[PDB]
Amino acid sequence: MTDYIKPYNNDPFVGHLATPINSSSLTRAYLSQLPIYRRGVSPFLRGLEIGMAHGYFLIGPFVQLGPLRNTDIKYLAGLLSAIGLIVILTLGMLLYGAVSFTNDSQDLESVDGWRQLASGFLLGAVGGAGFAYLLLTLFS
Amino acid sequence: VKVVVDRDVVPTSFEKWAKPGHFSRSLAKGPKTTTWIWNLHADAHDFDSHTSSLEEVSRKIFSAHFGQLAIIFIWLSGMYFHGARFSNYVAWLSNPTGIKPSAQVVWPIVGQQILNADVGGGMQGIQITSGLFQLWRASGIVNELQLYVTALGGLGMAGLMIFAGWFHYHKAAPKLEWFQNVESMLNHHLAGLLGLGSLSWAGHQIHVSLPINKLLDAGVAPSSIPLPHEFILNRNLMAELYPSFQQGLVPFFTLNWKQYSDILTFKGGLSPVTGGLWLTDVAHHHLAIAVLFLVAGHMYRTNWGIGHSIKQILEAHKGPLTGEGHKGLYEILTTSWHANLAINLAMLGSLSIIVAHHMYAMPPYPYLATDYPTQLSLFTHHMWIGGFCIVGAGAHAAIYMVRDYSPTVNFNNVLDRMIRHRDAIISHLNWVCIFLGMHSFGLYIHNDTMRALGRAQDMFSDTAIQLQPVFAQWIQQIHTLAPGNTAVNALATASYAFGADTVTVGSKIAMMPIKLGTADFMVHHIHAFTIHVTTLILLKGVLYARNSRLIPDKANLGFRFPCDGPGRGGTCQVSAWDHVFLGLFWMYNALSIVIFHFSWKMQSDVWGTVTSNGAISHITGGNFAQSAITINGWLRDFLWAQASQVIQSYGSSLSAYGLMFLGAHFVWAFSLMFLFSGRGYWQELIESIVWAHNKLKVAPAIAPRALSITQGRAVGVAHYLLGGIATTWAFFLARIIAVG
Amino acid sequence: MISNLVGVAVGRYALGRSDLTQLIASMCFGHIIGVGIVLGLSNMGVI
Amino acid sequence: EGCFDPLGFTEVFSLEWLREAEIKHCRVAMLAVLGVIAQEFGTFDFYNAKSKLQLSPDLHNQFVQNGALQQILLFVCAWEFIVGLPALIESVNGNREPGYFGFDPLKLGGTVGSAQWKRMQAGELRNGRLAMIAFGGFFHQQLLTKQGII
Amino acid sequence: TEVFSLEWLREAEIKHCRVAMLAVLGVIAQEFGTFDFYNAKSKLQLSPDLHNQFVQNGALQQILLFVCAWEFIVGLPALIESVNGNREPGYFGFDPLKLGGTVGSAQWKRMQAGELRNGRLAMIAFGGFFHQQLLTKQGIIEQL
Ligand SMILES: CC1=C(C/C=C(\C)CCC[C@H](C)CCC[C@H](C)CCCC(C)C)C(=O)c2ccccc2C1=O
């Protein structure tokens, strides 16, 4: 018994190696459950949900606050700016795999699986901008 | 707790004064360099850079305490003198409105007599904004004789402190054991100083209030004012002015406290006669604070065995995220004279700011709210004082990790964690600063773009309704309904800045329900931006002062060092004292924006005039309902319209505030000489002048050298602040006199 | 009156437990409990 | 002299250099009963009468003729004795004073000699301690209505 | 407790005790013929408030403050060391000091004979002598 087990194991058994607010022991498992870095899957699916999450809310800001927000046409300004930025952002994200070229044997996190998740990101972003598009139409 | 005195340690001799630099053998044998001339004064107050014997360091700082204390007493004893020899306080005592304040006269030498401002009362001079007349009126002082007696009584107390700081030293000297009695120290500071101080002044404004309250507020001449001793020598006079004095400390023992309700009340708000807070509420206030401090002054171990102690109090506080928490903090504060100074400078610095806010919010002195120059000056005065003090708190909280922190002696796992996950603290504050910057000032860029672009500012009006009157509006409404409901014993709010539509006017507006709007959310977040950046850089200098990732051997170099060299791409300005040097600058920007906000928003919506045909007409009538949202309005309607009151004064008596205004930019831009150039070029610049000095041998024995790398930056911030305060000092004292 | 003096006396005698047995501290704190309850009583004001 | 287990200390000072009040507390009471005998002594212009004495007939005018020096000198008299009590021994005491600790040693005195004493010494402050209960025992009634003779 | 500080303290006591005695023997001497006699009409014209701000005496006080300066600028160095200034009064006093010591056995320390008592009596008595006659207009309470 040296120092009586590290002053109470640094208070009631902390541990938590990959936890300190980066992702709790529940949240790190929630990240493994989270599709952006999902286990047991490859081509398209690691992405796809990425776009279905990003493009889904990209309609949000420019509908109420964008440079166009005072007439009836303004329901479209939230989507045109979003889709234009979606094309720009898709190019910017796809270019990362072109910059990387060291792990050509590790095709998942480098080039192959990288493009095989951004491919789902393109349809996810555009489609997700179209998914939240038809959600506020029946109430208007 | 024991009388341990080391009588006679240092003799009384002029021998040390004969040697320039006796405090250090390194600053005595080699005065062959110009740099030594500046090192003699730079280290003159760095007492921990001489001897390490704490029994002598404690016997060199308590000496400086009594020395500074004597300087302050010499300073205060003159204020009562200037308000008697040449002033207008008695005439202002009879006529307070038409007679402007003044307590400084000039002489006919070079035509400077134009500064004699026509204030009235048969005396000309220079207007004052120190609040001396309000304090003296709130003290019951009427005759000039009461000024001279207080001044002559101040000379005695000023001399006794010099003969005290020269007593416990060249004559006496307590041991080192007398300083670890921090337990016995807080029992005499919270009870002897705070306690008896809040009680002694409380017992004064109970018997001196009626020469101000039940006399000077009725309409009696200053000659008809009775004497303060005539009220005490005859208890029935106090009994008639207050029908509670007939008892004379009889229900005080009977616990029939309600019979003392003629002086002890809790009204709230302001008085519609004087112009400030109630003269009876402050007496009861200080009585309430005095008893609380008489209780709070008994908390630590003396020599009877009862009570807590800073030791086991901190040895008991734990916490999950803290680990070995709070323990060792006793050894932190009881060993380093420095260590107490940062927590003092931090608390007292924020205290000066908080009391500055409490000044304008609820004016405690009579005839203070209407006196706009004094009010505006005093707020920003304590504002900048606390700015310097909090940065000094960072300046020394950076000293601690370098000068008095050890990995074996003093230990708190809390402070350990502040240095173990140290890269996380500043990372959080960094992202917070950037989020509060790219938006608060980003929205400034946004709105200034919307106006020059066209119809975008028009569609911003709905967003101008947002944020503003959305938050903090309900807080004011809570305070509107706080009396009666959550304050049954209060017939008024905390201040009339809370009570809506309730305006108190004494020919000039005293307070207003400060209706937030338009851009208060903007400037408050400019504040929070400049506050988080200031806290970031200073806290960075605090916890990165010991362990640094770039250079691991950081403790060897020091605190006020230049850098390391051109290696590692470039190690430049990495000292914690430089985080304070730049910390002074972000504090400078913070306090500058806060004084701008306070000052201008006042006359925008608060300060104004009143007529019977209408209601309220401000000096500048509701301008920052739009001119605050953009950066342009801060120099289109703010920094531009102010030149009509600072420059258009040469034909009057306000010409000095224009000369100091235009001359403060000189010394500020003079700081741009040191904050931009380097010692290398300037050192190549001397040797040419020294060549001309070697041509005629007129070269001094003291070899001409450039300023130190650190001393140049210390002088640079000195001028950036002096030249960066005297301009707004001349500006705050420019318009407020013309529009007073 | 007598009820108030005995009120202070009972407020100082209700302070005689284990944590109060230390002489002068039990008396001073007694007034804190005594006068305080009286100030809480205050000729029965309450609400 | 009857007690058992409880904690409680009669007299005693932790630093035990408290002679400023303790030494004079039986002497301060000597000038207290002086007021009990009081200023009237028989015939001539009597100084004061009845229970009122102290403050009802305290003279209408009294900040000077009630001597400031009279109060001042008390402090001055105290300074001779009371100030000089931490240590502050003076050279005047004694003959052949050099090396005073060596000459005529004192010591504890519990041994054989000086048996059965200091009872007398301790006797006075017993009355002083008696007095504090007894003094204020008459003082509580002074606040009240004080009908007639009281 | 220290040497050089108590030096100026005991000196200032001596340097003013003679001043606090020649002034008493000067203020009493100038008012010996007008002490009583109907209380000199409340000090008569000797009341300081009645004086015309010392019109004729101001230029005289300046001359006095000048000469008195060098008088004390002789007292400052004459105290320094024993020789010259203090040494000649030194052996002068030693002539009565020898007889006084003979009357007082081994030495009879003269400072205990009356250097401190006279020095402090003059100061305290002159401090009270300046308040009873010059620092009270309305008595209110009878002064005894
Ligand atoms: C000018 C300058 C210097 C040189 C600074 C000097 C030489 C300071 C000069 C100040 C003194 C006080 C001026 C000389 C006056 C003498 C003291 C003589 C005075 C005698 C009577 C007037 C009292 C630097 O060392 C430096 C270093 C790093 C960046 C920039 C700079 C920089 O700009």
Side-chain angles (χ1 to χ4, degrees), chain A, chain B, chain C residues 1-22 24-47, chain D, chain E residues 1-41 48 50-70 72-144:
Chain A
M1 295 178 296
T2 61
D3 205 68
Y4 282 96
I5 316 108
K6 199 256 192 63
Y8 198 66
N9 295 107
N10 188 17
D11 293 312
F13 292 89
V14 272
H16 284 303
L17 191 59
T19 294
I21 312 299
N22 58 16
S23 59
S24 178
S25 183
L26 176 68
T27 307
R28 60 96 181 173
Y30 187 81
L31 293 185
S32 63
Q33 297 168 2
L34 168 117
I36 320 299
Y37 188 71
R38 177 165 283 180
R39 76 291 174 195
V41 83
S42 61
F44 278 92
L45 201 145
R46 177 171 290 109
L48 193 143
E49 305 292 336
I50 308 185
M52 293 184 62
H54 288 77
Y56 187 84
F57 79 91
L58 284 183
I59 185 74
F62 290 96
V63 158
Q64 298 179 355
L65 282 79
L68 290 177
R69 64 186 192 274
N70 53 23
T71 61
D72 51 357
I73 315 178
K74 307 309 195 267
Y75 177 71
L76 284 72
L79 185 66
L80 194 272
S81 61
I83 292 296
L85 187 61
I86 275 172
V87 178
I88 298 174
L89 201 277
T90 305
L91 297 175
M93 196 276 182
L94 281 169
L95 193 137
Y96 185 92
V99 176
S100 62
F101 55 87
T102 61
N103 290 323
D104 203 3
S105 298
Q106 187 181 359
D107 282 324
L108 273 303
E109 294 81 1
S110 60
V111 279
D112 183 72
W114 191 258
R115 273 71 177 275
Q116 288 301 321
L117 69 93
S119 306
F121 176 79
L122 187 147
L123 60 90
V126 180
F131 292 157
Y133 185 83
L134 299 176
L135 193 141
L136 297 175
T137 60
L138 76 163
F139 290 162
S140 61
Chain B
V1 177
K2 180 183 174 60
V3 184
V4 201
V5 58
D6 196 2
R7 308 171 72 90
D8 290 324
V9 177
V10 178
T12 305
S13 62
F14 300 93
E15 175 188 2
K16 302 298 182 59
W17 288 357
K19 292 183 269 67
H22 66 88
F23 52 88
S24 178
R25 294 183 296 178
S26 61
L27 296 178
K29 289 186 177 181
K32 302 179 179 181
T33 306
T34 49
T35 311
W36 171 88
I37 295 177
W38 298 92
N39 292 131
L40 187 145
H41 301 82
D43 297 326
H45 307 291
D46 206 13
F47 287 96
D48 59 355
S49 61
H50 304 91
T51 181
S52 62
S53 56
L54 194 141
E55 194 179 355
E56 187 65 26
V57 181
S58 303
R59 289 177 307 184
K60 290 299 285 297
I61 299 172
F62 174 76
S63 237
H65 283 176
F66 275 1
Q68 178 63 63
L69 200 256
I71 302 299
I72 298 175
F73 270 107
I74 299 297
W75 184 71
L76 263 87
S77 296
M79 300 301 100
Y80 293 94
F81 179 83
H82 290 292
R85 177 60 178 90
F86 52 105
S87 65
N88 55 3
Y89 174 76
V90 174
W92 181 82
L93 200 282
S94 64
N95 291 321
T97 299
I99 299 176
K100 300 295 295 298
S102 181
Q104 182 181 7
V105 75
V106 298
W107 286 350
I109 299 299
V110 289
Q112 58 192 12
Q113 278 194 329
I114 197 179
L115 275 72
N116 289 320
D118 286 356
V119 292
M123 290 291 298
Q124 59 182 1
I126 301 179
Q127 301 188 3
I128 60 102
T129 60
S130 298
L132 297 178
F133 293 163
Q134 290 76 14
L135 187 272
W136 300 345
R137 181 178 179 89
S139 299
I141 304 299
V142 175
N143 295 322
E144 291 179 350
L145 190 145
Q146 299 180 353
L147 280 313
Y148 291 107
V149 176
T150 300
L152 293 178
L155 178 60
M157 291 297 180
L160 292 177
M161 302 313 299
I162 295 185
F163 288 101
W166 184 51
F167 170 81
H168 300 78
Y169 289 92
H170 302 76
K171 191 173 298 293
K175 251 78 171 298
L176 184 144
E177 301 286 336
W178 185 65
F179 293 96
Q180 281 78 29
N181 298 116
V182 178
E183 290 86 356
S184 179
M185 180 175 298
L186 277 78
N187 291 323
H188 295 83
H189 285 179
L190 280 70
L193 178 62
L194 295 178
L196 294 184
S198 182
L199 182 58
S200 58
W201 183 257
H204 185 198
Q205 54 184 0
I206 296 178
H207 297 82
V208 84
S209 61
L210 64 164
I212 324 156
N213 186 17
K214 296 292 110 179
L215 282 177
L216 284 179
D217 298 330
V220 286
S223 61
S224 60
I225 293 290
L227 297 175
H229 68 81
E230 294 180 351
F231 293 158
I232 303 178
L233 265 301
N234 187 10
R235 294 183 175 180
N236 292 320
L237 306 189
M238 306 283 308
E240 281 190 347
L241 275 313
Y242 299 97
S244 179
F245 203 81
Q246 297 180 355
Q247 299 150 356
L249 299 177
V250 171
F252 184 85
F253 300 155
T254 326
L255 277 72
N256 196 343
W257 311 94
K258 297 181 180 180
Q259 292 187 347
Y260 297 105
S261 181
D262 288 327
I263 309 181
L264 304 174
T265 55
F266 185 75
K267 179 72 63 178
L270 283 72
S271 62
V273 178
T274 62
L277 295 177
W278 284 86
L279 294 177
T280 63
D281 289 337
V282 179
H284 191 65
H285 164 56
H286 287 174
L287 184 59
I289 305 306
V291 182
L292 190 149
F293 282 161
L294 260 65
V295 176
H298 300 79
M299 280 291 301
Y300 302 98
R301 289 188 175 103
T302 52
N303 200 3
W304 282 271
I306 197 181
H308 282 281
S309 64
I310 309 100
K311 180 69 176 183
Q312 290 187 355
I313 285 179
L314 301 164
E315 295 289 329
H317 294 80
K318 291 287 103 184
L321 296 178
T322 64
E324 301 175 348
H326 302 84
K327 293 188 175 178
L329 249 275
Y330 178 77
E331 289 78 5
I332 294 292
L333 282 314
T334 58
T335 57
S336 177
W337 275 94
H338 271 273
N340 286 330
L341 190 46
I343 65 174
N344 273 125
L345 284 177
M347 294 301 299
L348 302 170
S350 300
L351 190 272
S352 98
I353 277 115
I354 293 172
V355 69
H357 289 287
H358 299 178
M359 293 308 182
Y360 77 91
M362 49 291 291
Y365 300 93
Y367 295 96
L368 180 63
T370 61
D371 194 1
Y372 295 120
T374 293
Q375 177 67 249
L376 167 60
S377 296
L378 288 184
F379 172 87
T380 67
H381 173 64
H382 310 93
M383 211 59 200
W384 287 100
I385 293 171
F388 275 2
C389 290
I390 298 173
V391 179
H396 300 156
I399 286 279
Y400 307 156
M401 315 304 175
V402 182
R403 303 288 179 85
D404 196 75
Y405 184 79
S406 59
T408 303
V409 188
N410 306 327
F411 260 107
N412 189 184
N413 200 14
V414 173
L415 196 59
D416 284 334
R417 287 171 197 278
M418 288 289 296
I419 313 180
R420 284 192 297 179
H421 66 274
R422 57 178 164 88
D423 291 330
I425 315 291
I426 274 68
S427 69
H428 300 103
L429 272 306
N430 194 338
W431 177 74
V432 170
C433 291
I434 304 179
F435 172 74
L436 296 178
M438 279 295 298
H439 293 80
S440 183
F441 184 74
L443 287 167
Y444 272 169
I445 303 298
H446 169 60
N447 298 128
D448 186 62
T449 303
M450 296 177 100
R451 292 199 186 169
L453 269 276
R455 57 98 187 93
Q457 186 65 37
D458 191 8
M459 75 176 65
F460 184 74
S461 184
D462 56 3
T463 311
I465 313 296
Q466 272 299 108
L467 286 314
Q468 291 86 12
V470 173
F471 184 82
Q473 188 177 0
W474 177 63
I475 302 298
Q476 295 182 355
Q477 297 167 13
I478 293 171
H479 286 85
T480 60
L481 296 181
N485 293 323
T486 63
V488 188
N489 297 319
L491 294 179
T493 65
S495 66
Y496 284 100
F498 297 105
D501 293 332
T502 59
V503 179
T504 59
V505 180
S507 183
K508 286 168 66 64
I509 295 182
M511 286 302 301
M512 286 290 303
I514 307 180
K515 297 181 179 180
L516 305 172
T518 70
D520 291 326
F521 180 88
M522 303 295 309
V523 191
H524 281 84
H525 276 275
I526 299 290
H527 295 173
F529 160 76
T530 57
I531 292 312
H532 278 88
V533 176
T534 307
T535 59
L536 175 144
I537 184 166
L538 292 178
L539 179 59
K540 177 171 184 180
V542 172
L543 50 87
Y544 287 103
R546 182 56 170 270
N547 299 114
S548 62
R549 299 183 69 258
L550 181 60
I551 45 138
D553 51 354
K554 183 175 183 176
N556 181 25
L557 299 181
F559 180 74
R560 292 182 295 177
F561 63 91
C563 65
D564 193 10
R568 285 76 56 93
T571 302
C572 313
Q573 195 185 5
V574 299
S575 72
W577 180 70
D578 289 332
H579 303 175
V580 182
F581 159 80
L582 301 172
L584 284 163
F585 285 153
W586 270 109
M587 174 273 307
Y588 169 76
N589 189 17
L591 278 312
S592 302
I593 299 303
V594 174
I595 65 177
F596 295 161
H597 180 65
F598 163 80
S599 59
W600 182 263
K601 182 185 177 58
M602 285 310 104
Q603 54 261 13
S604 180
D605 285 331
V606 179
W607 298 348
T609 65
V610 172
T611 58
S612 64
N613 286 317
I616 294 174
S617 177
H618 306 97
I619 291 101
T620 62
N623 333 74
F624 267 19
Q626 189 63 251
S627 298
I629 309 177
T630 57
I631 308 177
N632 193 9
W634 281 87
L635 77 156
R636 179 185 66 249
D637 300 328
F638 173 50
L639 296 179
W640 183 76
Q642 65 92 25
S644 58
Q645 297 85 12
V646 62
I647 304 177
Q648 297 291 116
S649 61
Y650 285 180
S652 62
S653 55
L654 300 172
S655 59
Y657 298 103
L659 293 183
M660 293 298 295
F661 171 87
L662 193 133
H665 286 170
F666 179 89
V667 285
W668 174 86
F670 187 79
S671 67
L672 310 182
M673 180 200 300
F674 299 154
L675 302 179
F676 292 78
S677 183
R679 189 263 181 185
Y681 167 81
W682 291 96
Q683 191 57 51
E684 293 184 351
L685 190 271
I686 4 238
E687 47 209 32
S688 306
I689 308 175
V690 183
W691 181 95
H693 279 75
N694 290 126
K695 195 68 178 180
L696 202 251
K697 314 151 165 176
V698 74
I702 282 76
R705 300 286 187 266
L707 292 179
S708 180
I709 306 176
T710 63
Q711 188 60 249
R713 296 177 295 184
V715 179
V717 59
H719 283 88
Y720 193 97
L721 294 172
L722 189 142
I725 297 294
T727 301
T728 290
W729 167 80
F731 156 70
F732 283 171
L733 275 302
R735 174 193 284 101
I736 207 56
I737 309 293
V739 309
Chain C
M1 207 49 194
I2 300 182
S3 66
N4 189 12
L5 192 147
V6 176
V8 182
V10 173
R12 82 182 72 168
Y13 291 161
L15 276 56
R17 301 283 73 85
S18 61
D19 51 350
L20 270 302
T21 52
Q22 51 183 4
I24 188 69
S26 181
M27 186 56 190
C28 301
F29 200 73
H31 284 279
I32 301 180
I33 301 300
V35 182
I37 290 178
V38 177
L39 293 174
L41 200 274
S42 66
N43 301 114
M44 190 180 179
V46 194
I47 53 180
Chain D
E1 316 86 8
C3 80
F4 19 107
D5 90 294
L7 66 157
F9 262 135
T10 71
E11 211 237 329
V12 185
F13 337 106
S14 63
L15 285 189
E16 210 98 59
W17 311 305
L18 193 157
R19 309 89 193 239
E20 60 102 329
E22 154 220 56
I23 282 199
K24 277 192 173 180
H25 258 38
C26 52
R27 319 199 284 188
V28 152
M30 297 191 303
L31 58 87
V33 180
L34 291 187
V36 173
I37 296 181
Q39 297 291 2
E40 59 181 350
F41 180 52
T43 66
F44 299 93
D45 281 350
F46 283 81
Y47 239 41
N48 206 318
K50 215 205 174 188
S51 78
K52 282 190 163 188
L53 182 6
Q54 276 171 317
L55 290 143
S56 356
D58 202 9
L59 297 234
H60 248 282
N61 288 335
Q62 275 246 111
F63 65 52
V64 260
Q65 108 280 39
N66 217 165
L69 67 180
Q70 130 220 280
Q71 303 133 350
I72 278 174
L73 263 287
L74 174 271
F75 288 139
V76 194
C77 294
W79 302 335
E80 317 180 12
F81 299 19
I82 286 180
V83 169
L85 277 167
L88 296 175
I89 191 63
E90 307 163 17
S91 69
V92 50
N93 286 34
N95 252 31
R96 319 190 220 100
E97 322 80 343
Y100 206 89
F101 278 110
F103 288 137
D104 295 1
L106 282 67
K107 284 134 190 176
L108 201 288
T111 81
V112 175
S114 76
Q116 288 195 14
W117 226 42
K118 285 221 310 175
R119 161 77 38 191
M120 173 207 60
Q121 278 196 13
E124 209 342 88
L125 214 237
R126 293 163 196 159
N127 153 225
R129 140 250 314 238
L130 184 165
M132 73 81 51
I133 299 285
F135 267 121
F138 297 33
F139 266 100
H140 198 85
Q141 300 68 5
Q142 313 272 320
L143 173 148
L144 279 302
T145 48
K146 264 175 158 167
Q147 25 54 248
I149 295 172
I150 312 192
Chain E
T1 69
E2 192 59 29
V3 184
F4 194 73
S5 62
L6 293 180
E7 284 182 1
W8 185 261
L9 287 183
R10 64 178 61 96
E11 280 302 325
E13 177 182 352
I14 299 180
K15 294 177 181 181
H16 192 270
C17 73
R18 57 178 183 269
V19 179
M21 191 58 186
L22 62 89
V24 168
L25 292 178
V27 174
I28 291 181
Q30 67 178 356
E31 296 180 352
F32 185 78
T34 181
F35 268 159
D36 199 359
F37 291 99
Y38 189 62
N39 294 117
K41 295 180 271 66
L50 294 180
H51 292 117
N52 302 327
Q53 296 177 338
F54 303 94
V55 158
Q56 294 181 339
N57 290 334
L60 306 177
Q61 279 188 348
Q62 287 181 337
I63 305 161
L64 293 179
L65 299 177
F66 292 164
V67 178
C68 206
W70 287 284
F72 288 109
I73 304 176
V74 173
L76 295 167
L79 174 70
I80 298 178
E81 297 179 351
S82 63
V83 304
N84 196 15
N86 277 339
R87 135 254 175 181
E88 309 157 328
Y91 43 76
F92 176 84
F94 267 138
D95 275 10
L97 279 176
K98 201 278 161 188
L99 273 182
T102 300
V103 181
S105 176
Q107 184 181 1
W108 179 228
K109 48 281 321 163
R110 179 57 214 257
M111 106 290 172
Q112 195 72 3
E115 287 293 331
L116 300 179
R117 297 174 195 257
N118 195 338
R120 296 178 66 182
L121 190 149
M123 299 293 283
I124 301 178
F126 184 76
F129 180 79
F130 189 76
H131 174 79
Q132 299 176 354
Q133 289 77 228
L134 275 309
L135 297 175
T136 294
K137 287 184 63 64
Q138 179 186 357
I140 305 114
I141 308 327
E142 67 283 36
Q143 289 84 34
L144 282 77

